[PDB]
User: What shape does this take?
Amino acid sequence: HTLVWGVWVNGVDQGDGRNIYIRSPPNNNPVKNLTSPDMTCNVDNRVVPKSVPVNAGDTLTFEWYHNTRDDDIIASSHHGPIAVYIAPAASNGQGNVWVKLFEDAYNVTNSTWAVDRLITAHGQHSVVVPHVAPGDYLFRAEIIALHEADSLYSQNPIRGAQFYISCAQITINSSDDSTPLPAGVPFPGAYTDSTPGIQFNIYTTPATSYVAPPPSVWSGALGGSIAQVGDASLE
Ligand SMILES: [Cu+2]
Assistant: This one.
């Protein structure tokens, strides 16, 4: 159970974004139904009043939390990967629009899941803002908790992969558009019962064998990190 509190831009806190520039759901419960309209931007997808201004090449940091800011972030049980997607805001997340900017699943070198490193990072993970056309975008941050993913939700609705999905309203101002955004995947639709990485048993299958759900990270993506960019406690 986790939510996005707000974002940082080049290490500058943009402040509480909940129901302001984040399309916040009413609570931290996961989405589990892969064919749900809720897979797009969680259960309360609507235009919120603010879009965070950034330029291509800025470091954009998502900050997650559990109950209160800078707490346990997400239950340590919730091992799994983190991805970030982008879509043009005019799409409302509908259609073949979601382009993957970031993937981190299981790090063999460190022996840790992305979620494990997200807790250590006080809920902070970042992307480089891509050189797409200036305009309004949705950045869809997605944590998959796999602790109950041995079952498909479609076979046992009490279990299944848990999607913590948060859509941030970002406005890209300065961008040379050196990497025009292509068409993407649909949510719901990109993940099905047979998609690699959706049905996985963390108790019995080594994390070294885990393959995150496609799609692949876009050739235009400039990278990211799971690491604390800003200290919420100084505020
Ligand atoms: Cu949970």
Remarks:
- The chain is about 5% helix and 30% strand.
- The pocket of copper (II) ion is lined by residues 1, 75, 78, 145 (CB under 6 Å).
- The two ends are 25 Å apart (CA to CA).
